[PDB]
Design a protein around this ligand. Structure first.
Ligand code: HEM
Length: 399
């Protein structure tokens, strides 16, 4: 049983193991850091099965759950939020904050997403590059998703820059465990104060809605509200930052596509669709434990055994996506859903918001900076460690 997670074949590529497994052993056992075993599912149809089967559980207190790291096993001890719940608890809590993320709500949020992007671009422009290239991640990819979610949660404008920096420290590879936990506790402390404040004088934000609709009636307590707000903040932020950076690098990598996008920003939506399929920046979030025996392919997964369903592999499944390893914004899409945001009840709560942010970014970036260019050989791009999810640490650009 090979050790898992696997390492990316190279900076921008997925682990080489998946293609081989999809062809010769689509459902196989892998070995986790603690020596335990787990079933790895690599085919699109099977990943969808795991994501929706009622015989599988997301509860991390179940023996057999596939924790992939030492830290993961520790976090599994904290009280759970909806990300780690099964029905009926799952939707009972998730529906408390879903309103803000509906397709309709996100459509109404579009002008705000656009002004946020426009302002950040203007700041990056007036920040010039006269004395050298700028780091597109720090100056743009990081603040876009950060300012948006923080603002949606209820954070005041003046605190955005500092809070964006602290949240980044949580996941920065350079941060020490101490600095990471310190930033973590700090954000939690800050949200606690926001909840106390909003309980007294509610405003138009997620935290206020939680306080008024759930804390006051007694449906959840203050700490619960804090944890839910924290989940929404930390869940997909770092992924959003990486997707934006990955998007720019990909366009640099494929001049033809960039030319087409520049000529027709209306293609932004399809570019984003292909990006979320091609670069599956969140590939280790579909995990379960079997509540009872379940058959998947030619394998029997016994009760209490763990399962990891790779949506990254599913997104390269040649049986669903023709020429899966080719980035093609003009790709002819199959009836099957790409799985960059998961599948089933747990499907990313912010999928529509995420796509709206990316679409806004790629329909505006090259309009503002037609000559935007990565100011370093593409082969030198600073990617996240190969043993981690795909992403980019920093990206020097000129425009
Ligand atoms: C391009 C960026 C993003 C990607 C690629 C992404 C991907 C994912 C994936 C793969 C899952 C697992 C879904 C499943 O269990 O099937 C997920 C869950 C989740 N994401 Fe995201 N996400 C992104 C952005 C966001 C943002 C912006 C937020 C925060 C506002 C967010 C909040 C969450 C939450 C709370 C869950 C858990 C949902 C549940 O279990 O019910 N995501 N995301």
């Amino acid at each position: 049983a090979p050790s898992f997670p696997f390492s990316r074949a190279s900076g921008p590529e997925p682990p080489a193991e998946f293609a081989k497994l999809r062809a010769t052993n689509p459902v196989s056992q892998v070995k986790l850091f603690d020596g335990s075993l787990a079933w790895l599912v690599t085919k699109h149809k099977d990943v969808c099965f795991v994501a929706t089967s009622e015989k599988l559980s997301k509860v991390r207190t179940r023996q057999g759950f596939p924790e992939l790291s030492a830290s993961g096993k520790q976090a599994a001890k904290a009280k759970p939020t909806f990300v780690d719940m099964d029905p009926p608890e799952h939707m009972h809590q998730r529906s408390m904050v879903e309103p803000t993320f509906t397709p309709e709500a996100v459509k109404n949020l579009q002008p705000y997403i656009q002004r946020t992007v426009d302002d950040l671009l203007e700041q990056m422009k007036q920040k010039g590059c006269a004395n050298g290239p700028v780091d597109l991640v720090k100056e743009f990819a990081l603040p876009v998703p950060s300012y948006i979610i923080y603002t949606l949660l209820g954070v005041p404008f003046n605190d955005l820059e500092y809070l964006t920096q602290q949240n980044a420290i949580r996941t920065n590879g350079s941060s020490t465990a101490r600095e990471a936990s310190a930033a973590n506790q700090e954000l939690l402390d800050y949200l606690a104060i926001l909840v106390e404040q909003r309980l007294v004088e509610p405003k138009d934000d997620i935290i206020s809605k939680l306080c008024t609709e759930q804390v006051k009636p007694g449906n959840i307590d203050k700490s619960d509200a804090v944890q839910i707000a924290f989940l929404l903040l930390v869940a997909g932020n770092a992924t959003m930052v990486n997707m934006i950076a990955l998007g720019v690098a990909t366009l640099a990598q494929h001049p033809d596509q960039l030319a087409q996008l520049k000529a027709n920003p209306s293609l932004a939506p399809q570019f984003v669709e292909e990006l979320c399929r091609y670069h599956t920046a969140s590939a280790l979030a579909i995990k379960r434990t079997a509540k009872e025996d379940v058959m998947i392919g030619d394998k029997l997964v016994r009760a209490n055994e763990g399962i990891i369903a790779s949506n990254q592999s599913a997104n390269r499944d040649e049986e669903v996506f023709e020429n899966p390893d080719e980035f093609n914004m003009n790709r002819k899409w199959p009836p099957q859903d790409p799985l960059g945001f998961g599948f089933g009840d747990h499907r990313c709560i912010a999928e529509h918001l995420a796509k709206a942010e990316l679409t806004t970014v790629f329909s505006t970036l090259y309009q503002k900076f037609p000559d935007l260019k990565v100011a370093v050989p593409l082969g030198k791009i600073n990617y996240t460690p190969l043993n981690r999810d795909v992403g980019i640490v920093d990206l020097p650009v000129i425009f």
